[PDB]
Amino acid sequence: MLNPIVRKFQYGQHTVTLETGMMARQATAAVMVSMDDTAVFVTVVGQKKAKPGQDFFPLTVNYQERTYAAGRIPGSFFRREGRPSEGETLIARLIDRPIRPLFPEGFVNEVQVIATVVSVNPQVNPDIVAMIGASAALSLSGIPFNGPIGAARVGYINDQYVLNPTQDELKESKLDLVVAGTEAAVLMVESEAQLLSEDQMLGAVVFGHEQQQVVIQNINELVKEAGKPRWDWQPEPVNEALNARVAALAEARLSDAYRITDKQERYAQVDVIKSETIATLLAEDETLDENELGEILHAIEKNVVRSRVLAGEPRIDGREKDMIRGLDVRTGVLPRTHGSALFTRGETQALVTATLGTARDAQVLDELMGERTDTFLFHYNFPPYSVGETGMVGSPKRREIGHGRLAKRGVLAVMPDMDKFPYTVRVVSEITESNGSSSMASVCGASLALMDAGVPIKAAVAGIAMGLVKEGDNYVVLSDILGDEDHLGDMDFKVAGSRDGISALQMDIKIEGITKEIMQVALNQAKGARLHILGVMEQAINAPRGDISEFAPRIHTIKINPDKIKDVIGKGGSVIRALTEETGTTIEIEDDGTVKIAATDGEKAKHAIRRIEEITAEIEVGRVYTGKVTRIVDFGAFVAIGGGKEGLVHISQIADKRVEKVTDYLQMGQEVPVKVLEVDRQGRIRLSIKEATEQ
Amino acid sequence: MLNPIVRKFQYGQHTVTLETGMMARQATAAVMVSMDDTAVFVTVVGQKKAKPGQDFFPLTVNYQERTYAAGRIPGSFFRREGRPSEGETLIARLIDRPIRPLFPEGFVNEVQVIATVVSVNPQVNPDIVAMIGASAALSLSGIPFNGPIGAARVGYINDQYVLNPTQDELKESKLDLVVAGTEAAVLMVESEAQLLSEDQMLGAVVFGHEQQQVVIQNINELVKEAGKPRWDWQPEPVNEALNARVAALAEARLSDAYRITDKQERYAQVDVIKSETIATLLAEDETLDENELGEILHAIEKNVVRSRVLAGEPRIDGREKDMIRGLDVRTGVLPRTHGSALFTRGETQALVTATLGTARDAQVLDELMGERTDTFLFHYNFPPYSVGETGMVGSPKRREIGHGRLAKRGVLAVMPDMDKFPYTVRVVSEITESNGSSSMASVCGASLALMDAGVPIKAAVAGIAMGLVKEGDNYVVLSDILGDEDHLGDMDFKVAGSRDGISALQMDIKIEGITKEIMQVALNQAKGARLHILGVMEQAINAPRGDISEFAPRIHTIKINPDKIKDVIGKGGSVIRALTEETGTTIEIEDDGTVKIAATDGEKAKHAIRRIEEITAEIEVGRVYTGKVTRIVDFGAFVAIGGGKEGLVHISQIADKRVEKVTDYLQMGQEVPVKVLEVDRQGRIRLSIKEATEQ
Amino acid sequence: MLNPIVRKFQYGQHTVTLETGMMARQATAAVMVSMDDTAVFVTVVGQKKAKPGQDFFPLTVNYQERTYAAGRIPGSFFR
Amino acid sequence: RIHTIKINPDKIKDVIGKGGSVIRALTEETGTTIEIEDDGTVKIAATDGEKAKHAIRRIEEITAEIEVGRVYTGKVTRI
RNA sequence: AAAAAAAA
């Protein structure tokens, strides 16, 4: 009835299997890809017909993590999986970036690829198996697609590269990089790193690109027998005559406008050329259409900018390939916030703020590889006034979550260990103006806001957004690229890092033939510029300050005996409630003795510090104890001796095996010399009273 | 490179700092306004071109409270981030209402104002600072706007008015009137009051209007050096002939038709005339636009009704200036809910219901100013069938939150204090028909539903909406304006109060030249009309009565030794779940020594009291129990004996000495006779295995 | 002025009361239906003119459980 | 899975150690919520079979011996 | 000893 086709190949130490034809037979193609007990089901459905008047390729990628894949019922009140998480949206972006540029030019049919995680081995991460899955699904479908891609996560254990590291190994790794490539060239790189040197990162990318050849060979083998016939699609014929007709009229004039050098006079000059040339021949036979004309005019603009940059020295803004827009940097701009800074690159402004908190306010994010609690929170706001448009604010789009993640990778490598800084820290970066690359203006600002709040950060960090143009063998690397020159970049990349060593590299490639030395000079030029930005920031704030003091929560640490803390948590743990209500202060649950005191001022902290040492008087070695007799009855005398446990006297006696009598030395409330060197009965260390006799 | 313009003046005690040019340079204007460490960043972005479909003005105002202001991590579990709520939406409406009238007629270009709170001093409210901020931003851009508007919150303490009261001052105050006004006149008033006479409320509006003069003068001085050149905008030219042709064939045949008393009959006549004029236009329609002809027709209608109302006695429905619509009031209409009332004022009809609950079910509002718990909740539901239309129902719009808040101000003045009414109270109003002013029908309904459920309100309250029509030297004040008659009103206002004293007041003004001498008669006519509604309302329910017979929750507060209550909490709340569930009533966990036994009858209250007595009590003498070994302690034990708690036999304890070494009882199934013995301070109570009677 | 018209019949040992004319007069019809102290208010609004270009029949049914019907304030954070 | 075994109604005392201290270590080491039970019907709540069998093996090991205050051929393992 | 209801 139904027969599955299975191919099994060895990637690293994990057997990986592709299963096809078994499920979802009405979708254009579908594959279950399984790698060492983690499995994801990936399916592509592509429209057969072009929706008329579409001028942008509509590609949808959906990635979703069903909780039944871990064997757990969802925590939500509904007990059902909700809207896609931040983490899931980011994984979808990782699949989309290497796929979108690989479809042929002028392909505009609707395409949707859905990846569902269906089972998870906690040790094996589902994303690197999802990327192979999308590559398999697209290459098996008839859809016009320029060859399969692999994917490989490379780590850096003990100065060795280790392909596809398992989750525990990442604890002691200094690098986590995700290469995706075809057989000809790399297509994208994403990473976080504990300040590695440049050549170690480029070495990891050249390594990962070779280990992916196994997947490329294996998907090509599967498509030989189990693939659908490629449905024939031919790009719509270009009108050579129309392109020549519009060129004679505007090419020389548009070139002249770019030769004119200004922020806005070139703009106005281009507009008068565009408006007239569009008007001319607009009414001639009614052949001209707004879509037909606008596209050719923008295409001529892109041609004159590319050709001008590869040869003519001036860029659109007039700075040379190695120059960065002017800096202006300001600290403590907001009142009554824990720490704040404004970083301006001249047309990119990031107002960024760091707020501290007690451990209670840390996030507890539950996911398939296990619940974990993180103490560093990064949020990136891109409000619509920042690019001069009007739109609904509402909730963040994928790019805001993408940029918020990349900036977090940049700073995370320089944050202090929780043992020497116990507070949770949230950084919110609010973009106020955006014409450059605003994610890298966020990293610089975040390092200022953190060290202004007086977190002991390990070093200053800064970012640079860069582009490469390689129409011919000649290439030019461009530093601090404007947003308005995205189309000019044949590759573009971001190089967030420190005075020495790189923190987070991200790189998306759109052209064939980028060999390793063309990456090497491009991020050597990136090291140059990053150092210049770092130099200006050291003059604004050289080192971290002592503390925020703007109603900053204060935390204090002290080591107390495990027995004394158990009694402060005595009566079932009720004893701790008696303290927290009196001092407005939480005491934390390290029962092995590392007491944390946390409070909103420098008094209730000190009151709690006085109270913990005051209220517990349990010592088993002890000393002569001038405690006060409460009852001198048989079965041992009762004596007031203080905190912890008040010991009862050793059995039937006062001291010396009941040499004396209860009637002898009888009064209430009297000071007597107690000592606590006895047996541990009723769960109490017993005691005795050395009154001119001794046991 | 960058330096701000800075302008600081003194408003009342605080110092206001206006700061410009430093941030968001691509928005049409942006201003950082700071008042005693509370700071809000406010920006306006306005599209220069107009969309050629718009026949209304799209102005959008967003107010948002970043919780990084005042240094705290967001409570929301998901992503530690927030979305717009009631508290923010009401502040957006307070900025919106004064700005819309000032913008010139025919200005249809889209405009967006975004106001972000970036720091809060909890003594100074952010709302007043924002209204100055939006006024500065709009007046500083070139957007055509008629003058800056200052704002002013006016408190009232020991019969002295105080400007911008701090939170500490306000709590003691008897009014909280907001006023916003240009140099010529007031433009908006919003206020709650502890039942003050009309002359005290009018005194506040004039006083606040005069203190705002400093803000208006200062904003002009800033615009004199930092301001943009005003962008040219001309109202679209109006063709007198196009208006004249429709006017000639309408006004006479509409003046007679407005005379017809029946609403449906007149509606059918005017619609027929309208179609006939459209037919008369014939070739070329009206500039080839039916809409243009319709606009002229609506205008001719508005002019005839307005001119008629201020020259002649009859209104659209044949009523005079001082005739409130026919009143039909019916209490207790719903079964098995704690209190309900249907209030019908002519066509506007409101079904209102009151429900009581335990203090536990109060909501916790995490406002930027500080966390607070309110015990009184008002919810206003406006379903689309109330208008006779079809539409969605699910999510409340801005107006439902606006009206819900105004209705809450009406009743909040007359609620009993929690220290003689220990319940949370929720009022839900369902507007079942809405021709007229629905929100003030909701206040009456709420005042009947509350005093029907038996809450002892301080007096009955009621409300009315009113309109002023004003020309070159004369004006008419109309009572109970209908929805259709709002277009003729130049001023409209709503008043809610008891037999003596205004409780809430709201005014919006659309024209200059209204004055204290007009408002003096307008509120006196309101005192007349309100005092009639109170009499009809009084007949249905004269005074608050007893509590609901059965459905209402009743509270019992039995006193228990709180250490035993703490043990009944168990491992932080695990046994009490069963106890509340088996009773099926909301018995509380409060450990203060007052156990809340809340139940819907006396039987479940007594069952719960007996259930807590079973687990808390220990028999003081009992019998010679054959106690059986239940547990191990450290050299200790727990023995089952009479009452809810086990006793301990320490191994040595049968006669205060080891007369018979007691090792043999130290195992299960021995069950040897014991007798009750003393309770010690430690909590390990004394027990001994002795047949002899022990006390 | 205003008064309902009421019909009461016995269905399966529960008295059922049909009550009309008192509320939602603006909507095309409204009928408070009650069966032994469980009560639901039901209203229908229909457009008098058919929108040109419609082919299918757009019927929308909305059922709502207000929690004030059971005497309890809501469990939701926003109340 | 929830696992349950009978262990002798005296030697059960030795499973627990002095108070909660050894219970913390055993629950932390095995990743199981093993509770204190005087009856000896020790309940070892677990999230999978591996954690259950790991907890069964350690509770078997650390209380495997009958104290009758008798003679043992006890080998000195550490001075 | 492992201590009191809060579905953002």
Author numbering:
A (entry chain C), B (entry chain B): 1 to 695
C (entry chain A): 1 to 79
D (entry chain A): 554 to 632
From the manuscript:
Polynucleotide phosphorylase (PNPase) is an ancient exoribonuclease conserved in the course of evolution and is found in species as diverse as bacteria and humans. Although PNPase can catalyze the polymerization of nucleotides, its main cellular function is the 3ʹ-to-5ʹ degradation of RNA (Grunberg-Manago et al., 1955). While the catalytic core performs the phosphorolytic action, the KH and S1 domains participate in RNA substrate capture and autoregulation (Wong et al., 2013) and are powerful facilitators of PNPase activity. Cryoelectron microscopy (cryo-EM) was used to solve structures for E. coli PNPase in the apo- and substrate-bound forms and in a ternary complex with sRNA substrate and Hfq (i.e., the RNA carrier complex).
